[PDB]
Amino acid sequence: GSLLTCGGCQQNIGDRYFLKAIDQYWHEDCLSCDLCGCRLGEVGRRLYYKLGRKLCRRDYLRLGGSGGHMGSGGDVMVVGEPTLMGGEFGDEDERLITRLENTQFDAANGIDDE
Ligand SMILES: [Zn+2]
Ligand SMILES: [Zn+2]
Numbered sequence: 001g002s003l004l005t006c007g008g009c010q011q012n013i014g015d016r017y018f019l020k021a022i023d024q025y026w027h028e029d030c031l032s033c034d035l036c037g038c039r040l041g042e043v044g045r046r047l048y049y050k051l052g053r054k055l056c057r058r059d060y061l062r063l064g065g066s067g068g069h070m071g072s073g074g075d076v077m078v079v080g081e082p083t084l085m086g087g088e089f090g091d092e093d094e095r096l097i098t099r100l101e102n103t104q105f106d107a108a109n110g111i112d113d114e
Contacts, residue, residue, distance in 0.1 A: 001114075003104055006030050007054075016107040021047045021097045022054060031097055035059035041091045044098030048091070056095060058088050 002012040007022070008030030019026045019042065032039055034055040040048075048057045061067045071086020083090040108114045 003102055008032075013102065014104075014113055016102055016105045016111070016113060017099065018102050019097045019099055021095075022049050026097070028099070031095075033059065033095075035062060040095035040097065042099050043096050045096035046093045047096060048094040054095070056091075057093070058090070061088050 001014060004013040004018060004020070004025040006013050006018070006027045007024040008026055013025055013027055015027065017028055019028055019031045021044075031042075031054075034053060036056055036059055038056075040056065048060075049055065050060060057065075058067065058072065065088070067086075067088030069086055069088060072088040072090075073082070073086050074084035074089060075087060076084040078085060102113075104113055106113055
């Protein structure tokens with residue numbers, strides 16, 4: 001039933017896996033980005049968010065940072081590589097949420113629990 005509550009849909013996390021870090025709990029497909037429209041970086045480490053926004057550093061950099069361009073990343077030769085392309089970098093200290101498991105991870109119904 002109801003174990004944790006996600007801050008994205010707030011419909012409770014009865015899943016087997018779940019994500020959390022900001023200050024509350026989330027969902028795997030709920031914890032998305034605000035403005036870039038990506039999916040941060042689900043490699044548990046640090047996290048980047050504002051007072052009341054789960055907005056990226058690059059998102060924050062797009063309006064109140066130093067970017068606001070198309071070419072994102074570090075200024076390096078364009079060979080078709082991730083991150084390093086322009087100026088609005090990536091993560092490292094960004095929303096690297098910890099992909100955790102639920103206490104009732106059981107999963108009595110496959111990708112659905114009781
Ligand atoms: Zn949710
Ligand atoms: Zn973003």
